[PDB]
Design a protein around this motif. Structure first.
Motif, mmCIF file in Angstrom:
data_model
loop_
_atom_site.group_PDB
_atom_site.id
_atom_site.type_symbol
_atom_site.label_atom_id
_atom_site.label_comp_id
_atom_site.label_asym_id
_atom_site.label_seq_id
_atom_site.Cartn_x
_atom_site.Cartn_y
_atom_site.Cartn_z
ATOM 1 N N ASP A 194 55.498 60.679 44.663
ATOM 2 C CA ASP A 194 55.614 61.704 45.698
ATOM 3 C C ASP A 194 55.647 61.078 47.092
ATOM 4 O O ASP A 194 54.650 60.482 47.526
ATOM 5 C CB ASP A 194 54.439 62.681 45.550
ATOM 6 C CG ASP A 194 54.467 63.824 46.557
ATOM 7 O OD1 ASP A 194 55.385 63.895 47.398
ATOM 8 O OD2 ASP A 194 53.551 64.675 46.491
ATOM 9 N N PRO A 195 56.764 61.193 47.828
ATOM 10 C CA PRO A 195 56.837 60.571 49.159
ATOM 11 C C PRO A 195 55.954 61.228 50.200
ATOM 12 O O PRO A 195 55.780 60.639 51.273
ATOM 13 C CB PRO A 195 58.320 60.704 49.537
ATOM 14 C CG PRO A 195 58.815 61.862 48.732
ATOM 15 C CD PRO A 195 58.021 61.865 47.461
ATOM 16 N N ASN A 196 55.386 62.409 49.930
ATOM 17 C CA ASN A 196 54.501 63.077 50.885
ATOM 18 C C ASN A 196 53.027 63.020 50.508
ATOM 19 O O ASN A 196 52.191 63.467 51.300
ATOM 20 C CB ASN A 196 54.924 64.539 51.067
ATOM 21 C CG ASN A 196 56.369 64.653 51.492
ATOM 22 O OD1 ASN A 196 56.783 64.033 52.470
ATOM 23 N ND2 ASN A 196 57.155 65.396 50.732
ATOM 24 N N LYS A 197 52.683 62.478 49.341
ATOM 25 C CA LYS A 197 51.289 62.356 48.930
ATOM 26 C C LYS A 197 50.559 61.325 49.790
ATOM 27 O O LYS A 197 51.109 60.265 50.113
ATOM 28 C CB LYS A 197 51.220 61.956 47.454
ATOM 29 C CG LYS A 197 49.810 61.673 46.930
ATOM 30 C CD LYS A 197 49.821 61.416 45.445
ATOM 31 C CE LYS A 197 48.412 61.197 44.908
ATOM 32 N NZ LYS A 197 47.609 62.456 44.959
ATOM 33 N N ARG B 196 44.933 57.196 54.653
ATOM 34 C CA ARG B 196 45.356 58.576 54.386
ATOM 35 C C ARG B 196 46.779 58.831 54.903
ATOM 36 O O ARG B 196 47.027 59.739 55.704
ATOM 37 C CB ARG B 196 44.366 59.587 54.984
ATOM 38 C CG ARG B 196 42.880 59.311 54.712
ATOM 39 C CD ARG B 196 42.625 59.037 53.243
ATOM 40 N NE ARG B 196 43.028 60.164 52.407
ATOM 41 C CZ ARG B 196 43.456 60.044 51.155
ATOM 42 N NH1 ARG B 196 43.538 58.841 50.595
ATOM 43 N NH2 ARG B 196 43.796 61.128 50.465
ATOM 44 N N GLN B 197 47.718 58.023 54.423
ATOM 45 C CA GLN B 197 49.118 58.096 54.812
ATOM 46 C C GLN B 197 49.994 58.009 53.570
ATOM 47 O O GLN B 197 49.542 57.539 52.524
ATOM 48 C CB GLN B 197 49.482 56.956 55.771
ATOM 49 C CG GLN B 197 48.930 57.090 57.181
ATOM 50 C CD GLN B 197 49.356 55.935 58.046
ATOM 51 O OE1 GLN B 197 50.437 55.378 57.851
ATOM 52 N NE2 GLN B 197 48.510 55.557 59.009
ATOM 53 N N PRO B 198 51.262 58.424 53.662
ATOM 54 C CA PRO B 198 52.162 58.323 52.500
ATOM 55 C C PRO B 198 52.518 56.872 52.189
ATOM 56 O O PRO B 198 52.186 55.944 52.929
ATOM 57 C CB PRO B 198 53.403 59.118 52.927
ATOM 58 C CG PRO B 198 52.967 59.932 54.117
ATOM 59 C CD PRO B 198 51.912 59.101 54.795
ATOM 60 N N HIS B 199 53.202 56.674 51.055
ATOM 61 C CA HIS B 199 53.569 55.311 50.678
ATOM 62 C C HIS B 199 54.657 54.760 51.594
ATOM 63 O O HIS B 199 54.639 53.573 51.934
ATOM 64 C CB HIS B 199 53.961 55.228 49.189
ATOM 65 C CG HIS B 199 55.259 55.889 48.827
ATOM 66 N ND1 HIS B 199 56.488 55.371 49.180
ATOM 67 C CD2 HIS B 199 55.519 56.983 48.068
ATOM 68 C CE1 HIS B 199 57.447 56.139 48.692
ATOM 69 N NE2 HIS B 199 56.884 57.123 48.010
ATOM 70 N N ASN B 200 55.590 55.608 52.036
ATOM 71 C CA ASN B 200 56.606 55.213 53.024
ATOM 72 C C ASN B 200 57.375 53.969 52.594
ATOM 73 O O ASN B 200 57.830 53.192 53.428
ATOM 74 C CB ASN B 200 55.984 54.998 54.406
ATOM 75 C CG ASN B 200 55.898 56.289 55.204
ATOM 76 O OD1 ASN B 200 56.777 57.147 55.099
ATOM 77 N ND2 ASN B 200 54.837 56.440 55.994
ATOM 78 N N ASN B 201 57.500 53.771 51.282
ATOM 79 C CA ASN B 201 58.206 52.625 50.700
ATOM 80 C C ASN B 201 57.645 51.284 51.175
ATOM 81 O O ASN B 201 58.342 50.265 51.135
ATOM 82 C CB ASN B 201 59.711 52.710 50.966
ATOM 83 C CG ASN B 201 60.356 53.845 50.199
ATOM 84 O OD1 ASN B 201 60.241 53.924 48.976
ATOM 85 N ND2 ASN B 201 61.004 54.753 50.919
ATOM 86 N N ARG B 202 56.374 51.268 51.574
ATOM 87 C CA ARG B 202 55.676 50.051 51.954
ATOM 88 C C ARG B 202 55.116 49.351 50.722
ATOM 89 O O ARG B 202 54.935 49.959 49.660
ATOM 90 C CB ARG B 202 54.533 50.369 52.920
ATOM 91 C CG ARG B 202 54.995 51.026 54.220
ATOM 92 C CD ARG B 202 53.830 51.686 54.963
ATOM 93 N NE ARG B 202 52.769 50.724 55.252
ATOM 94 C CZ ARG B 202 51.630 51.019 55.873
ATOM 95 N NH1 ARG B 202 51.389 52.263 56.275
ATOM 96 N NH2 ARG B 202 50.723 50.069 56.088
ATOM 97 N N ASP C 147 43.795 53.852 42.211
ATOM 98 C CA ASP C 147 44.525 54.385 43.343
ATOM 99 C C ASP C 147 45.295 53.266 44.030
ATOM 100 O O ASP C 147 45.017 52.078 43.831
ATOM 101 C CB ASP C 147 43.575 55.066 44.323
ATOM 102 C CG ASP C 147 43.184 56.451 43.861
ATOM 103 O OD1 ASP C 147 43.941 57.026 43.047
ATOM 104 O OD2 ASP C 147 42.132 56.954 44.302
ATOM 105 N N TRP C 148 46.272 53.663 44.849
ATOM 106 C CA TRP C 148 47.179 52.736 45.514
ATOM 107 C C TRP C 148 46.808 52.558 46.980
ATOM 108 O O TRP C 148 46.421 53.517 47.660
ATOM 109 C CB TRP C 148 48.620 53.231 45.410
ATOM 110 C CG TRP C 148 49.175 53.155 44.034
ATOM 111 C CD1 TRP C 148 49.119 54.119 43.066
ATOM 112 C CD2 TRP C 148 49.889 52.047 43.461
ATOM 113 N NE1 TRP C 148 49.750 53.678 41.927
ATOM 114 C CE2 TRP C 148 50.238 52.415 42.144
ATOM 115 C CE3 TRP C 148 50.275 50.789 43.937
ATOM 116 C CZ2 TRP C 148 50.947 51.562 41.294
ATOM 117 C CZ3 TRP C 148 50.982 49.938 43.088
ATOM 118 C CH2 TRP C 148 51.314 50.336 41.785
ATOM 119 N N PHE C 149 46.967 51.328 47.470
ATOM 120 C CA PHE C 149 46.574 50.942 48.816
ATOM 121 C C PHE C 149 47.702 50.157 49.458
ATOM 122 O O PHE C 149 48.313 49.301 48.811
ATOM 123 C CB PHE C 149 45.281 50.107 48.770
ATOM 124 C CG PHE C 149 44.107 50.873 48.232
ATOM 125 C CD1 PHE C 149 43.938 51.038 46.860
ATOM 126 C CD2 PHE C 149 43.199 51.464 49.095
ATOM 127 C CE1 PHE C 149 42.875 51.776 46.361
ATOM 128 C CE2 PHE C 149 42.139 52.191 48.606
ATOM 129 C CZ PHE C 149 41.981 52.348 47.233
#
Ligand SMILES: [Zn+2]
Ligand SMILES: [Zn+2]
Lengths: 7, 59
Positions: B3-6, B12-18, B28-30
């Motif tokens: 989900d690009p908006n999760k 507390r930010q999206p993944h933003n393809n980072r 969880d992802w960091f």
């Protein structure tokens, strides 16, 4: 630890 | 969940393809930026089968 966007 | 908006991570930010790394305890992802892990660092841990934990899970 899985990874993503590693290019 | 790609989900690009999760919201994720300490920040507390999206993944933003980072670049992101998945904690081996909470799963969880960091963003690498926020936990001090570069792509080269994280890929090397993954290649060598070395588990990694986020700062909260470490404590
Ligand atoms: Zn972050
Ligand atoms: Zn964790």
């Amino acid at each position: 630890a899985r990874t993503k966007q590693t290019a | 969940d790609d989900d690009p908006n999760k919201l994720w991570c300490i920040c507390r930010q999206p993944h933003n393809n980072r670049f992101m790394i998945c904690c081996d305890l909470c799963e969880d992802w960091f963003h690498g930026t926020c936990v001090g892990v570069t792509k080269a660092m994280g890929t090397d841990m993954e290649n060598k089968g070395i588990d990694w934990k986020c700062p909260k899970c470490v404590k």
